[PDB]
Ligand binder design. Sequence first.
Ligand SMILES: Cc1cc2nc3c(=O)[nH]c(=O)nc-3n(C[C@H](O)[C@H](O)[C@H](O)COP(=O)(O)O)c2cc1C
Length: 138
Amino acid sequence: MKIVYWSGTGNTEKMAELIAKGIIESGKDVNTINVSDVNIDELLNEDILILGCSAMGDEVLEESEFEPFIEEISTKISGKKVALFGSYGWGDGKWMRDFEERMNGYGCVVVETPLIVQNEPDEAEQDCIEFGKKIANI
Ligand SMILES: Cc1cc2nc3c(=O)[nH]c(=O)nc-3n(C[C@H](O)[C@H](O)[C@H](O)COP(=O)(O)O)c2cc1C
């Protein structure tokens, strides 16, 4: 499987590592890729797309790297299964509700409830691991 993410201070990156750990513990293989290093064509061969990005201003996806990537793959992912995650600061997850609505609008099947954690995982570490374990049971 593959996990693609954008992280500005490392919070979503940490989430990505933990989710990967959960998938690996379930017996499966997975590679985490920062959005800057992604290859669209190889990504599109995946059964499940696990995408993460923190909440940027104001309650939107990061604009210089992540959004352009989402827009680029938007027309080629109808019918694909996707799982979403990301870290946020002071909001209540509005950016994630919009992210889910957007992927559904592109014809994707959002497989699990999006995983959102405030700031660095720390306390929510097992939660991140368990989310990966859920995706591995798909
Ligand atoms: C310019 C900027 C805008 C932000 N806007 C929001 C926002 O609208 N809502 C929110 O809850 N957090 C917001 N945050 C906080 C980040 O989502 C939060 O610090 C998160 O933990 C960052 O994770 P990352 O290290 O993976 O980027 C913003 C942070 C920055 C730098």
